[PDB]
């Protein structure tokens, strides 16, 4: 609930990218460093946090700036997002928003607010940081 971290090695955001790894999310919305998820995929094809099958590249990088997440559209922080009943979400292109902001932005255009890549309701999912 503080800084994003990897539950396997237990390194924080800073320490993850500082040595050349990425922050990645599974499609089921579970966050890991790239080295830990890769080494995990090597031993089983299931998510370490919820056991859903993540074989065949059902994960992707996410791009967060601070280590502390926030929605760049409404500008609320994690706490404010969650206490309201909103979810934290990532597009498949790795861009993070609160769920209500991304929905509303999609009523107006079918592009990612951050990178303009084509998206729809089926191309973003919650993440559970």
Partner 1 sequence: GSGSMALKRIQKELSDLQRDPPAHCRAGPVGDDLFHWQATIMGPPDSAYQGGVFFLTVHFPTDYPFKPPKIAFTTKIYHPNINSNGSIKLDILRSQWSPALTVSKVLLSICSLLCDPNPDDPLVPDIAQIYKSDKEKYNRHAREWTQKYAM
Partner 2 sequence: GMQIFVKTLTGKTITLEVEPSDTIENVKAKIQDKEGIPPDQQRLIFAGKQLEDGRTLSDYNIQKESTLHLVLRLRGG
Q: Pick out the residues of the known binding site for Zn(2+).
A: 6, 9, 28, 30, 33, 36, 47, 50, 71, 74, 93, 95, 98, 101, 112, 115
Helix (H, G, I), strand (E, B) or coil at 9: coil
Query: Which among Zn ion, partner 2, partner 1, none contacts residue 21 (Cβ within 5 to 8 A by kind)?
Result: none
Q: In what order do the strands lie in the sheet with 59-61?
A: 31-33, 23-26, 59-61
Residue 2 interacting with partner 1 (CB under 8 A): no
Number of shown-chain residues binding partner 1 (CB under 8 A): 28
Tell which residue, 72, 60, 63, has the closest CA to residue 16.
63
Site for partner 1 in 6-45 (CB under 8 A): 7-10, 36, 39-40, 42-44
Helix (H, G, I), strand (E, B) or coil at 57: coil
Distance separating alpha carbons of residues 88 and 82, to the nearest angstrom: 8
Residue 118 interacting with partner 1 (CB under 8 A): no
For tokens 């790795």, what's the residue? 94
CA dihedral 5, 53, 28, 19 (to 10 degrees): 30
Question: Which of 3, 34, 46, 99: binder of partner 1 (CB under 8 A)?
Answer: 46
Q: Which residues bind partner 2 (CB under 8 A)?
A: 1, 7, 28-30, 49-52, 61, 63, 65-66, 72, 82, 87, 93-95, 114-117, 126-128
């Amino acid at each position: 609930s503080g800084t994003v971290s990897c539950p396997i090695c237990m390194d924080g955001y800073s320490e993850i990218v500082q040595n050349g790894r990425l922050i990645v999310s599974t499609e089921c919305g579970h966050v890991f460093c790239s080295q830990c998820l890769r080494d995990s995929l090597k031993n089983a094809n299931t998510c370490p946090t919820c056991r859903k099958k993540i074989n065949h590249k059902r994960y992707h990088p996410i791009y967060i700036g601070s280590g502390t997440v926030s929605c760049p559209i409404c500008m609320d922080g994690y706490s404010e997002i969650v206490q309201n009943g909103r979810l934290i979400v990532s597009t498949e292109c790795g861009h993070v928003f609160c769920s209500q902001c991304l929905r509303d932005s999609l009523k107006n255009a079918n592009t990612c607010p951050t990178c303009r890549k084509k998206i729809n309701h089926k191309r973003y999912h919650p993440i559970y940081i």
